[PDB]
């Protein structure tokens, strides 16, 4: 493990630099080495981890979608045989994507989730687990697709259960979890009504709690509530 010779604090330091330089592969590798030091992550460090791998897998997912779209057009009416190259390259990007998700899932299993006792950290990491299974779901086609989907569902649900018990309904992690689980329902689970019910209930419960908030926290929560609003306007 090639970050093994770097100080934990230096990895975190370089992750922040990598973010500034928009060098997100680097950022993710620095944060992976930081996790493998074996210590729990602080709030700020958890944010670095998720921003890094979100950017990395986000480019992969965008590329996969472009290539999957081309490949579907190669299957269509009046479409000239172009060889195995579109499939081949979509598969190469897919396998790369799948390896990033497996790497993130591996960090969470070994051993971030099990050492996360506080609600803010446990919910954060279980939401990540749901998110990275959801990205595997987006590209899965075999039999295993159902099992990937269930695994995403199960992480999101455990996270939902904890967040409802332990966090205010304006909490930005709770809000973002609900948003993403609703996206899961709409885009993965073929459950748009659940997606809409969850987004609306989450939005309405946060609205009723905003009065408890300082001006800065109000800003943090209403940003994500707007994202719920955006999906509901898209979905209805």
């Amino acid at each position: 493990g090639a970050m093994g010779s770097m100080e934990r604090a230096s990895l975190i330091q370089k992750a922040k630099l990598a973010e500034q330089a928009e060098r997100y592969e680097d950022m993710a590798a620095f944060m992976k080495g930081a996790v493998e030091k074996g210590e729990e992550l602080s709030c700020e460090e958890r944010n670095l981890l998720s921003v890094a791998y979100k950017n990395v897998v986000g480019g992969q997912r965008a590329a996969w979608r472009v290539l999957s779209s081309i490949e579907q057009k190669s299957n269509e009416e009046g479409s000239e045989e172009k060889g195995p190259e579109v499939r081949e390259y979509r598969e190469k990007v897919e396998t790369e994507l799948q390896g990033v998700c497996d790497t993130v899932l591996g960090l969470l299993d070994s051993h971030l989730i099990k050492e996360a006792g506080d609600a803010e950290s446990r919910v954060f990491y279980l939401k990540m687990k749901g998110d990275y299974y959801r990205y595997l779901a987006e590209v899965a086609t075999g039999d295993d697709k159902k099992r990937i989907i269930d695994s995403a569902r199960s992480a999101y649900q455990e996270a939902m259960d904890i967040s409802k018990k332990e966090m205010p309904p304006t909490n930005p992690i709770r809000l973002g979890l609900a948003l993403n689980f609703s996206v899961f329902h709409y885009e993965i689970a073929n459950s748009p009504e659940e997606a809409i019910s969850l987004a609306k209930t989450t939005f309405d419960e946060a609205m009723a709690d905003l009065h408890t908030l300082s001006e800065d926290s109000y800003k943090d929560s209403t940003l994500i509530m707007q994202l719920l609003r955006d999906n509901l306007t898209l979905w209805t």
Partner: peptide, 6 residues
């Protein structure tokens, strides 16, 4: 979807 809380 949404993922770095202030």
């Amino acid at each position: 979807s949404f993922x770095x809380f202030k």
